[PDB]
Amino acid sequence: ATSNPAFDPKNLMQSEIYHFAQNNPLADFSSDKNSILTLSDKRSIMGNQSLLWKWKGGSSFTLHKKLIVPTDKEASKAWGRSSTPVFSFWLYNEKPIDGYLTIDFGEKLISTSQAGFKVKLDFTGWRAVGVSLNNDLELGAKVDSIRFKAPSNVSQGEIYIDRIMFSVDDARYQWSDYQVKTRLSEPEIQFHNVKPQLPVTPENLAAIDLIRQRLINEFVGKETNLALEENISKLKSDFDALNIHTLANGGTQGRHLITDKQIIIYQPENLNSQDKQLFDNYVILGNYTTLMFNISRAYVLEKDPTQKAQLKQMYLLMTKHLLDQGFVKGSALVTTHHWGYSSRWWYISTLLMSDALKEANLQTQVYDSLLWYSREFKSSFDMKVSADSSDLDYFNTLSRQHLALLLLEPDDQKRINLVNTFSHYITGALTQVPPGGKDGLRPDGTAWRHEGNYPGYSFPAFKNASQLIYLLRDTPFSVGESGWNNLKKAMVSAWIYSNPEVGLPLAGRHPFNSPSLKSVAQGYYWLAMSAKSSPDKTLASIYLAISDKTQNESTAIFGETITPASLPQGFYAFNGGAFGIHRWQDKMVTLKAYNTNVWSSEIYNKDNRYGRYQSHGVAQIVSNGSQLSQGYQQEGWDWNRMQGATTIHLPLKDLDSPKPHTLMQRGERGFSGTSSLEGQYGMMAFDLIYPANLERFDPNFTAKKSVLAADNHLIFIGSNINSSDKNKNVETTLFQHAITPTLNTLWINGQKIENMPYQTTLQQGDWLIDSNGNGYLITQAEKVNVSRQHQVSAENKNRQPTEGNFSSAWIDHSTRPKDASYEYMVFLDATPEKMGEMAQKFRENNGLYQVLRKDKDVHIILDKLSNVTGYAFYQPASIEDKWIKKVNKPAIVMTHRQKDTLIVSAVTPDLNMTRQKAATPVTINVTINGKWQSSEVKYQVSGDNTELTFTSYFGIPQEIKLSPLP
Ligand X SMILES: CC(=O)N[C@@H]1[C@@H](O[C@@H]2OC(C(=O)O)=C[C@H](O)[C@H]2O)[C@@H](O)[C@@H](CO)O[C@H]1O
Tell me the one-letter amino acid at 920: T
Nearer Cβ to ligand X, position 267 or 397?
397
Instruction: Tell me which of Mg ion, ligand X, none is bound by residue 464, counting a contact when its beta carbon lies within the kind-specific cut-off of 5 to 8 angstroms.
Output: none
Q: Map the footprint of Mg ion across residues 162-221, applying CB under 5 A.
A: 162
Nearer Cβ to ligand X, position 632 or 716?
632
Nearer Cβ to ligand X, position 625 or 660?
660
Q: How far is the CB of 163 from Mg ion (least distance, A)?
A: 6
* HSE-CB of 738 using CA atoms within 13 angstroms: 19
Residue of 377, 380, 367, 368 whose CA lies nearest to 407: 367
Instruction: Tell me which of ligand X, Mg ion, none is bound by residue 457, counting a contact when its beta carbon lies within the kind-specific cut-off of 5 to 8 angstroms.
Output: ligand X
Residue of 211, 718, 719 whose CA lies nearest to 470: 211
Q: How far is the CB of 955 from ligand X (least distance, A)?
A: 22
Q: Is 162 annotated as a binding residue?
A: yes
- β-pairing, 673-677 vs 681-689, is antiparallel
Of 64, 192, 450, 649, the active-site residue reads: 450
Nearer Cβ to Mg ion, position 11 or 48?
48
Q: How far is the CB of 188 from ligand X (least distance, A)?
A: 24
Instruction: Tell me which of Mg ion, ligand X, none is bound by residue 162, counting a contact when its beta carbon lies within the kind-specific cut-off of 5 to 8 angstroms.
Output: Mg ion
Q: How far is the CB of 27 from Mg ion (least distance, A)?
A: 15
Number of residues that bind Mg ion (CB under 5 A): 6
Nearer Cβ to ligand X, position 436 or 930?
436
Instruction: Tell me which of ligand X, Mg ion, none is bound by residue 46, counting a contact when its beta carbon lies within the kind-specific cut-off of 5 to 8 angstroms.
Output: Mg ion
Q: Are 786 and 759 in contact (CB under 8 A)?
A: yes
State the greatest distance between any 2 C-alpha atoms of the chain, in Å, as a whole number: 113
- Return d(Cα 582, Cα 576) in angstroms, integer: 16
Number of residues that bind ligand X (CB under 6 A): 17
Is 869 an interacting residue with respect to Mg ion (CB under 5 A)? Answer: no
- β-pairing, 758-762 vs 784-794, is antiparallel
53 to 47, 73, 128, 144, 581: CA distances (angstroms)? 18, 36, 17, 21, 72
Is 47 an interacting residue with respect to Mg ion (CB under 5 A)? Answer: yes
* HSE-CB of 460 using CA atoms within 13 angstroms: 18
Nearer Cβ to ligand X, position 662 or 744?
662
Residue of 144, 312, 143, 293 whose CA lies nearest to 230: 293
432 to 242, 387, 451, 492, 574: CA distances (angstroms)? 47, 8, 16, 18, 18
Q: How far is the CB of 325 from Mg ion (least distance, A)?
A: 14
* HSE-CB of 564 using CA atoms within 13 angstroms: 13
252 to 161, 542, 545, 617: CA distances (angstroms)? 15, 52, 53, 64
Nearer Cβ to ligand X, position 224 or 231?
224
Q: Is 834 exposed, middle or buried (0-12, 13-18, 19+ CB in 10 A)?
A: middle
Nearer Cβ to ligand X, position 126 or 454?
454
Is 513 an interacting residue with respect to ligand X (CB under 6 A)? Answer: yes
Instruction: Tell me which of Mg ion, ligand X, none is bound by residue 191, counting a contact when its beta carbon lies within the kind-specific cut-off of 5 to 8 angstroms.
Output: none
Is 44 an interacting residue with respect to Mg ion (CB under 5 A)? Answer: yes
Of 457, 610, 690, 871, the active-site residue reads: 457
260 to 125, 303, 343, 548: CA distances (angstroms)? 22, 35, 11, 39
941 to 223, 755, 880, 923, 929: CA distances (angstroms)? 60, 62, 19, 18, 10
Contact string (CB under 6 A) for ligand X, positions 216-235, x = contact: --------xx----------
Q: Which 3 state secondary structure label does DSSP give 430?
A: helix
Is 450 tagged catalytic?
yes
Is 19 an interacting residue with respect to Mg ion (CB under 5 A)? Answer: yes
Q: Map the footprint of ligand X across residues 623-662, applying CB under 6 A.
A: 662
Handedness of CA 460, 465, 471, 473 (dihedral sign): negative
Contact string (CB under 6 A) for ligand X, positions 177-216, x = contact: ----------------------------------------
Instruction: Tell me which of Mg ion, ligand X, none is bound by residue 225, counting a contact when its beta carbon lies within the kind-specific cut-off of 5 to 8 angstroms.
Output: ligand X
Contact string (CB under 6 A) for ligand X, positions 417-456, x = contact: --------------------------------xxx----x
Instruction: Tell me which of Mg ion, ligand X, none is bound by residue 510, counting a contact when its beta carbon lies within the kind-specific cut-off of 5 to 8 angstroms.
Output: ligand X
Is 783 an interacting residue with respect to ligand X (CB under 6 A)? Answer: no
Q: Are 166 and 4 in contact (CB under 8 A)?
A: no
- Return d(Cα 512, Cα 338) in angstroms, integer: 29
Phi and psi (nearest 5°) for 326?
95, 20
Q: Which residues pair with 598 in a beta bridge?
A: 595
Q: How far is the CB of 394 from ligand X (least distance, A)?
A: 10
Instruction: Tell me which of ligand X, Mg ion, none is bound by residue 483, counting a contact when its beta carbon lies within the kind-specific cut-off of 5 to 8 angstroms.
Output: none
Q: Map the footprint of ligand X across residues 600-619, applying CB under 6 A.
A: 604
Q: Map the footprint of Mg ion across residues 552-591, applying CB under 5 A.
A: none
Residue choice 17, 46, 504, 730 for contact with Mg ion (CB under 5 A): 46
- Return d(Cα 492, Cα 538) in angstroms, integer: 8
Instruction: Tell me which of ligand X, Mg ion, none is bound by residue 831, counting a contact when its beta carbon lies within the kind-specific cut-off of 5 to 8 angstroms.
Output: none
Q: After which residues is the chain broken (C to N over 2.5 A)?
A: 113, 138, 221, 934
Listing DSSP states for 14-66 in one string gives: --EEE-S-SSSTTTTEEE-TTEEEEEESSS-SSSS-EEEEEEETT-EEEEEEE
Element (H, E) at 392: helix 392-397
Is 516 an interacting residue with respect to ligand X (CB under 6 A)? Answer: no
Q: Is 13 annotated as a binding residue?
A: no
Q: How far is the CB of 661 from ligand X (least distance, A)?
A: 7
Is 393 an interacting residue with respect to ligand X (CB under 6 A)? Answer: yes
| Interface ranges with ligand X (CB under 6 A) | 224-225, 393, 396-397, 449-451, 456-457, 460, 508, 510, 513, 515, 604, 662
Q: Binding-site residues, please?
A: 19, 46, 49, 162
| Interface ranges with Mg ion (CB under 5 A) | 19-20, 44, 46-47, 162
Active site residues: 450, 457
Q: Binding-site residues for Na(+), please?
A: 19, 46, 49, 162
